Amino acid sequence: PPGPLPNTPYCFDQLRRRFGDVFSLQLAWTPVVVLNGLAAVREALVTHGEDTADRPPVPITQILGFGPRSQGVFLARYGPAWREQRRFSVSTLRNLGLGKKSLEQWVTEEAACLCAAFANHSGRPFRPNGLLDKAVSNVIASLTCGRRFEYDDPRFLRLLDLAQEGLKEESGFLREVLNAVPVDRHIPALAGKVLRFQKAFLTQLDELLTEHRMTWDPAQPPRDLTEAFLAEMEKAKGNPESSFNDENLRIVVADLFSAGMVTTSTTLAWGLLLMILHPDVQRRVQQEIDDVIGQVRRPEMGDQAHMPYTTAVIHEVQRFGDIVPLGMTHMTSRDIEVQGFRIPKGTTLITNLSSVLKDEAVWEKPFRFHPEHFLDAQGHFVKPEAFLPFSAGRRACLGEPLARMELFLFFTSLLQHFSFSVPTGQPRPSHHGVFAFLVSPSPYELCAVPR
Amino acid sequence: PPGPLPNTPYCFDQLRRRFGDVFSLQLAWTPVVVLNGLAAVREALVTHGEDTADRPPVPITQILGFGPRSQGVFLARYGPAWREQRRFSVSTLRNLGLGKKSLEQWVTEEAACLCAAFANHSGRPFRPNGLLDKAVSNVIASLTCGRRFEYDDPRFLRLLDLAQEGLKEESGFLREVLNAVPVDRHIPALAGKVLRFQKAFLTQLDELLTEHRMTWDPAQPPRDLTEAFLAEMEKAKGNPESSFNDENLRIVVADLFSAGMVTTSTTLAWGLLLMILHPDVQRRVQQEIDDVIGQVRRPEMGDQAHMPYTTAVIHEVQRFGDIVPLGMTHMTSRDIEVQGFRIPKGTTLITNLSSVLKDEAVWEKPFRFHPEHFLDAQGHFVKPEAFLPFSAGRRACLGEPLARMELFLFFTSLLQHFSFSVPTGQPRPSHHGVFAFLVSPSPYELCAVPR
Amino acid sequence: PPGPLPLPQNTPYCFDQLRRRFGDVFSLQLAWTPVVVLNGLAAVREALVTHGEDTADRPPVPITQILGFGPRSQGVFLARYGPAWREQRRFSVSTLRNLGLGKKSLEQWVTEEAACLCAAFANHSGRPFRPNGLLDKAVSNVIASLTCGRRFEYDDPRFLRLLDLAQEGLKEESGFLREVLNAVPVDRHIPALAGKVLRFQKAFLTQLDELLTEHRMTWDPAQPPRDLTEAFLAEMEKAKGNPESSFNDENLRIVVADLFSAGMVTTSTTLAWGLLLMILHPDVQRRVQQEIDDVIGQVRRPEMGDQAHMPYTTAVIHEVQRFGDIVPLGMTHMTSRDIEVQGFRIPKGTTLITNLSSVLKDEAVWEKPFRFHPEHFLDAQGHFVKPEAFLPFSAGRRACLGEPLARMELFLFFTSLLQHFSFSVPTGQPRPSHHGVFAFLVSPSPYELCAVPR
Amino acid sequence: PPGPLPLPQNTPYCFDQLRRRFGDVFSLQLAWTPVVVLNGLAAVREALVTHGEDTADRPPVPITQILGFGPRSQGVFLARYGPAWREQRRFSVSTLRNLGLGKKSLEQWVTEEAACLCAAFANHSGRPFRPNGLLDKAVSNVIASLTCGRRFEYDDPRFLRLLDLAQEGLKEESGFLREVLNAVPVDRHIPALAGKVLRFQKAFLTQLDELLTEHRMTWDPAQPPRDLTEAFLAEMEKAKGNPESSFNDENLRIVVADLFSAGMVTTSTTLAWGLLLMILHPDVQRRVQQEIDDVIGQVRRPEMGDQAHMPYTTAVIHEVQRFGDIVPLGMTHMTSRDIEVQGFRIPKGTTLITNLSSVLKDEAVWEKPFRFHPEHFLDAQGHFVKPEAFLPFSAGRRACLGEPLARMELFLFFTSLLQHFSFSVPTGQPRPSHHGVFAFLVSPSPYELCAVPR
Numbered sequence A, B: 001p002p003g004p005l006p007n008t009p010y011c012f013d014q015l016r017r018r019f020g021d022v023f024s025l026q027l028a029w030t031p032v033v034v035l036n037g038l039a040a041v042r043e044a045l046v047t048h049g050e051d052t053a054d055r056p057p058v059p060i061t062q063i064l065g066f067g068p069r070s071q072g073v074f075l076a077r078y079g080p081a082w083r084e085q086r087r088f089s090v091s092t093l094r095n096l097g098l099g100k101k102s103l104e105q106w107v108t109e110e111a112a113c114l115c116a117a118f119a120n121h122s123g124r125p126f127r128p129n130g131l132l133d134k135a136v137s138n139v140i141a142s143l144t145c146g147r148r149f150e151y152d153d154p155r156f157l158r159l160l161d162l163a164q165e166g167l168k169e170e171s172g173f174l175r176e177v178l179n180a181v182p183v184d185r186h187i188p189a190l191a192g193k194v195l196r197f198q199k200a201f202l203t204q205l206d207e208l209l210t211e212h213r214m215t216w217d218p219a220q221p222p223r224d225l226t227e228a229f230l231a232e233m234e235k236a237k238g239n240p241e242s243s244f245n246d247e248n249l250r251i252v253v254a255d256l257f258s259a260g261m262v263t264t265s266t267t268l269a270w271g272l273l274l275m276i277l278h279p280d281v282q283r284r285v286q287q288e289i290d291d292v293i294g295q296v297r298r299p300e301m302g303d304q305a306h307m308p309y310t311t312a313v314i315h316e317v318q319r320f321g322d323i324v325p326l327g328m329t330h331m332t333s334r335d336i337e338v339q340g341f342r343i344p345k346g347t348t349l350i351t352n353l354s355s356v357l358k359d360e361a362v363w364e365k366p367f368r369f370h371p372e373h374f375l376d377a378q379g380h381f382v383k384p385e386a387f388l389p390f391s392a393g394r395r396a397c398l399g400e401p402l403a404r405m406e407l408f409l410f411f412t413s414l415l416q417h418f419s420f421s422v423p424t425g426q427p428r429p430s431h432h433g434v435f436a437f438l439v440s441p442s443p444y445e446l447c448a449v450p451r
Numbered sequence C, D: 001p002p003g004p005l006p007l008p009q010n011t012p013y014c015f016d017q018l019r020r021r022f023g024d025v026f027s028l029q030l031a032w033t034p035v036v037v038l039n040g041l042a043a044v045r046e047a048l049v050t051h052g053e054d055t056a057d058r059p060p061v062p063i064t065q066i067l068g069f070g071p072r073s074q075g076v077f078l079a080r081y082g083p084a085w086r087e088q089r090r091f092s093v094s095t096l097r098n099l100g101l102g103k104k105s106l107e108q109w110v111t112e113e114a115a116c117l118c119a120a121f122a123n124h125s126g127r128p129f130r131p132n133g134l135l136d137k138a139v140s141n142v143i144a145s146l147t148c149g150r151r152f153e154y155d156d157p158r159f160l161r162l163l164d165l166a167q168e169g170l171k172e173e174s175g176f177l178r179e180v181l182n183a184v185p186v187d188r189h190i191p192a193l194a195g196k197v198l199r200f201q202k203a204f205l206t207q208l209d210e211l212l213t214e215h216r217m218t219w220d221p222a223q224p225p226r227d228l229t230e231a232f233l234a235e236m237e238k239a240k241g242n243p244e245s246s247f248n249d250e251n252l253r254i255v256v257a258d259l260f261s262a263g264m265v266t267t268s269t270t271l272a273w274g275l276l277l278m279i280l281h282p283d284v285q286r287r288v289q290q291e292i293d294d295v296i297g298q299v300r301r302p303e304m305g306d307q308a309h310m311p312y313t314t315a316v317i318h319e320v321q322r323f324g325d326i327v328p329l330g331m332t333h334m335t336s337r338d339i340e341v342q343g344f345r346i347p348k349g350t351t352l353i354t355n356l357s358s359v360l361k362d363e364a365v366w367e368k369p370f371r372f373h374p375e376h377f378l379d380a381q382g383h384f385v386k387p388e389a390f391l392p393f394s395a396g397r398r399a400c401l402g403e404p405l406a407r408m409e410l411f412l413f414f415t416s417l418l419q420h421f422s423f424s425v426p427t428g429q430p431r432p433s434h435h436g437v438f439a440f441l442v443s444p445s446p447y448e449l450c451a452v453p454r
């Protein structure tokens, strides 16, 4: 399983073009394998997806005192616990997604608030990041709290703080997880002070959902995800195992919040940046907006099908933005062939999602913002198989349906109500982004003016 | 002038204890000299202070289109321009300082707001950084705008943001200034897009002070620094030179804001952190507060002289906090002896202020929070010569008088009104800080409860 | 002149990215003083050939100053574009031509050195060894012939000290040389405590100084010069008026020093790549020997003339140089006045880095850039061809002085060795790496090989 | 067990900080798996002596797996605390003593090697050279004597191969050894393409394998063993019941391999420090020679017995060791069960780093820790004393096996040399560095010296 003997994506590109698509890091120690084709990624996550759906250990789990059946989804290990919970959330997001417009309602009204909040800046320039976080966040709060939050609500502002800083604390641990061993089984616990904010963030949910159980009517069909969880807690009251505890509830919600907010929010931030950066495209999206939705009604999901160019654009934002370059890290559950190579049980798989998204041999102009990628000769939307921002296989993103929804509803709502540009003095912002395990656009401010 | 042939502070300590106090970096290319004693620093900045008050070139000045007589103070080069302006600001801070309690007025009321703002969190935990930035910022706003700003004011929120990100943008250029050559005289100007936020920040001042210009009564004694500047402008209208332009006004204010806010704010953050970290000391400070000021009246500058322990404490916060470890970077105006060594005209001097503040041969417990450092056998305040957080000599900090004020007034006002602790679940924060050209405490939250 | 802007140890897999993000010409340190990296064959040709007269300057380095170079007492390698370097480039090309062809002088010296190298190999009796130290002695001796009159016994203590001195001195200068992709000249007057830094480079000059001092005593002033030193001494008389002119004692020893360092390690390392690849592709080795037996035979010594009739060996030798790719960034250049390349203005006094590797491994030029593939140099009929992308010695007014002598060394040593021996990996051993350790000079990772007669 | 917490090559001047911020015992990687750095003399003694039992384990390294170690076919150096290592520590200390002064065996072999070394030096005729290669040969030969019966001619191709193999092989292993301040064991089954990584270490085993195979032909099974291999072979006979027992052919060559690598480089590098400091402090050189002429004279060969009557030379040699400080971090240890040092709990299986440098250069112990200062070892009357802080060979159940033989080598080689020659810096040259290049082994930066008779 190749690789050499003795900042990271522009780096992996070299190793790829020296070693092929599948290659090994740390051959001599414990091998960590980097998957690079669309071909390589599909083979590992789809073809052998059941055996590569495990998560490599991280001290986060231990530090936060996870254990038995009290891990979330994100870092949960392949086993009953995770399967239980992947099951529950996909079930729950499909019932609420369609069902009685529940998820749609919550999003569309959140868009209306976001629009209000933008409008409140009176075309005086600002940076849309904080607002984009609140909006996206609220959608998850609806899903898991019953309520949405006032943008100025101190509780909400604390929650956001808690979820942001908790997430910078864990990415420390998460990037090192491209090498060293599990943890001495028993981390020092002085290790406590390291996830302060992550732990503080659990504590605040713990209570927000404690007061939600008080609201909840046990003798009626569940209204949101928490309620559907609590209900399921009843069925399983017997079972000494089963991952439906109070313990797990808050982690699950915590996961949804972190995994959910920042990814959707950051994308919309690339969206807006690219919109002011290619006003050509912006007009055309709005041209289509006025033709299909008009200026009176609220954009709804049904419009999506009739909106080739907007759809195309949204997808190109995702592919050019390329926000989670290495996705999240996997581990084998038993040995496995990929492209001929033996890959032993327990092995770190790094899934170079960026290499698929920016594949030179797939996309007409991989390093350019180019909505054509998604448009056929007639201007119908098409989506290449290389389109994998939410990854693929057993462990692909839980949120995909809700995110597809958020990106379409927020993005249109905004381009319907406003025209975005670069502030009239300013020298015009960068295409390139700052590269963590999550890539944001470098800070820009924009103007929003009505039409 | 010694040094070796072919992180940074724990690093220089080695080279010190291998090469002595004055040593050279880049001996073979262009030598950059690092000054290390209290002895070494005093000899360079005080003794030869007139020849070492120059600032090494940076692309910032060029990029922002500084030039003739249109640099501020901070990055201004040794010459008429900077002299003119150091002059003007020390004069102005001295008159406003005592004069008619102007600066004291502005500070004490700002402390009252800060206290209000804290009290608005109802003992539910928060991190004080944002509030500490607003308060300190307002003091500069008073100095330079006439009024203060509502904490929730969108213009103010934009201003702070602009001053923050613009300062992050410049510290990139500022830490590289421990090596490579000036700039090709004519930077690429595509280099524009690099200081977007610093430039955006100037533009917003430009208009905040433009509307002050109209408020201002030219036939009366100037009320604040801007006014005093404008007065001095009409005066020098003759002189084709003179640094009293519109051009320079905004850079000067910009300098005051950036140099002023973040330093004072960060210190107070270290203050509160150390307060909740050593409740022992907190009580004692409050013991004195109750004895000297009481529970009715607002702490005023006069009280300082009667408050040995609080003074001691505030100073130990500064010394342990050690926020600007390398100070700001200097350059020789002509050759110079220090500790025997020839130091050619045009030479980067790095002033290891941390090595002075944490001098092992000077302080009884350099790496510990220890207010005794400043208390004699009878518990009178004393200040060692090694106390140099504002540096020393020709180019020491302009703000020192206003900062001493800010620290005393804010810090006491707060410990008079509240008791600070670590949130009741939480594992208790770190002594150690994140090391840029400015060192902050790692993020902590605290509770503020009345007494 | 493009390149990335900030907010912010090995470098060629790195430049490949910046190339495919910024195009072929790009800038490092845009905001400070720009350093420009040339990437195409197109980009390189345009700077070093088209504007060659304005890009043939060398960027300052503390080496010159530390070694107390100055007026007309710099060598060729680090000499600054001016009368001095011009003077000396011309002398050495003149001198290498005359001796090259002339009376088989250079050929004679190389062939017999091959004969010793072969003897040295044969003395290991098929028991494995690494060929590096022998390859350094042989190559070195060719330069010793050029500049000292005689060759050296492989066990000679003076020789062994010389090689030691030239190796470590070269190790001391590469420190300075890699940093020369950024900071300013030197305070005009380096600290001189800076002495202790080139100890071995200085020691190496002192020993030459003395080997050539005793050559001067041998030299017959009233007869045609027999080697490069002699032709230098003659030219020194000629100029004994001129207060300027770079023909001093001062400059002699630097010039030789340059020839020794530039010359030995480069040729030597290539031959090391040659043998490694030979044992690594025994397929090719047989074919080269097939040809050898056809053209030269088993009795006479390979000579330069055979080269023309040996397509496949030529091909191979060239593919060794291209895959080996030993001096990836070449040596560093500087503009003498502004210049445009690919549309871009490039100001007087500017560090040019010439990415030779990017030309040699050009994806858009070579069928299989990352593979050992002699076909690169063979047409459909199996005649030797050389693409324009073949630039291991670089190009333009400052391209390698040594090219004719090195073409000669590679051909003669490499054939001589494949004529007499068969090389292979020692019988237990796991088989060595294609990849090499990346200094400003890239070697093969250490391997040992067996040399058995045929 | 203290140490810093996060959010985020040249490591000893680094540890000094953490020491003076966290105390003597502190933790690396608290949040992952803790690695503990011992700093006092106090901290080191407590761990290695007091709990020496339970800290005598070696942390896993891919080296063992890669070299196909396994059951009880590990050497001593990397061997894991167990029957295997106990067996073999015991065999080597037993054997080194019997040979130490039983019948002057070890002494005879060292003293004659000194006499060759002296000849080899003398053969450079006062013309300058660097003593490193010769220092490696001599030290190496002592080990050859112990393990091959033979010594080797300094020009012997086999010997030259062997040294080459033992150097590069040791280069290759220090890659692995310095990462062993963090990441996990190895996937139990390393990729084996991992083969190509220790080529030279494996090549080195193979050559011993067959130097010692021809030793067994020589060896007379019905007589008292005359060196370490022979003693091993006899012990192998007796254990040819026991299915376990570490006395195999398998283990023999690793044991020798260990003795060669551990042994040669350390002793050789010290002597290199010794000579460098001698030319660097000619003041001290004369005084050592003054003592030499007083005690040994100019006729007879220095012998071990002279050591007792030679306070100043002893002092000096010890100061060379302390100042030189060649293995700064020693070798890395691991706990066999939990353990409480300076109050702190240290869990079963934990990487202990023993900062030997911090003990040798302890500021609170040595009058002038950063200066070459033989007084450290001389009392008020000029009797030799040795502080407890003198720990170059470390301490405890896993302290250096070679100490007696090393003490011997240092005295005999060092005196022999200073008796016959006077060492100085070459007459042109600017005079070398006190400071050294910092691997897991610290050498003096390359210097050359002159040896002239007296």
Ligand code: HEM
Pocket: A073, A074, A075, A076, A086, A140, A255, A256, A257, A259, A260, A261, A263, A264, A267, A323, A324, A327, A328, A329, A389, A390, A391, A392, A394, A395, A396, A397, A398, A399, A400, A402, A403
């Ligand atoms: C454009 C917005 C989003 C993007 C680009 C995105 C992308 C991803 C990616 C790449 C993964 C890694 C899957 C793997 O390990 O192969 C992931 C996992 C995950 N995501 Fe998303 N996501 C987005 C929105 C959301 C939101 C809205 C939610 C919840 C509301 C969510 C919840 C999750 C969860 C729970 C996982 C862990 C999956 C598991 O461990 O079973 N994501 N996401």
Ligand code: HEM
Pocket: B073, B074, B075, B076, B086, B140, B255, B256, B257, B259, B260, B261, B263, B264, B267, B323, B324, B327, B328, B329, B330, B351, B389, B390, B391, B392, B395, B396, B397, B398, B399, B400, B402, B403
């Ligand atoms: C505890 C709060 C503060 C600290 C620790 C501090 C520290 C420093 C330091 C170390 C320098 C570098 C001087 C040198 O180059 O050697 C400096 C310069 C400067 N500071 Fe402060 N400062 C503080 C507050 C302030 C405030 C409140 C102001 C204005 C309101 C201010 C304005 C300036 C200016 C304009 C300079 C540039 C001096 C010149 O270039 O002439 N500082 N300060």
Ligand code: HEM
Pocket: C076, C077, C078, C079, C089, C143, C258, C259, C260, C262, C263, C264, C266, C267, C270, C326, C327, C330, C331, C332, C354, C392, C393, C394, C395, C397, C398, C399, C400, C401, C402, C403, C405, C406
């Ligand atoms: C395969 C063996 C060799 C290779 C690959 C090689 C390559 C090079 C390269 C890349 C340069 C840099 C030119 C530039 O600045 O663009 C150079 C320069 C030079 N080479 Fe070589 N060379 C080899 C053998 C030799 C030998 C045998 C000699 C002399 C015996 C020699 C003498 C020189 C000299 C004196 C320069 C400096 C040119 C100047 O500044 O005018 N080279 N060589």
Ligand code: HEM
Pocket: D076, D077, D078, D079, D089, D143, D258, D259, D260, D262, D263, D264, D266, D267, D270, D326, D327, D330, D331, D332, D392, D393, D394, D395, D397, D398, D399, D400, D401, D402, D403, D405, D406
């Ligand atoms: C000045 C010469 C030498 C020095 C400074 C030296 C130093 C050391 C040190 C620091 C250790 C590490 C012990 C530990 O783990 O704490 C060690 C171990 C060892 N040394 Fe030496 N050594 C020297 C000479 C020798 C020689 C001459 C031999 C054999 C001829 C030798 C054989 C060994 C062996 C086999 C070990 C491993 C001990 C074990 O794992 O049980 N050393 N040495």
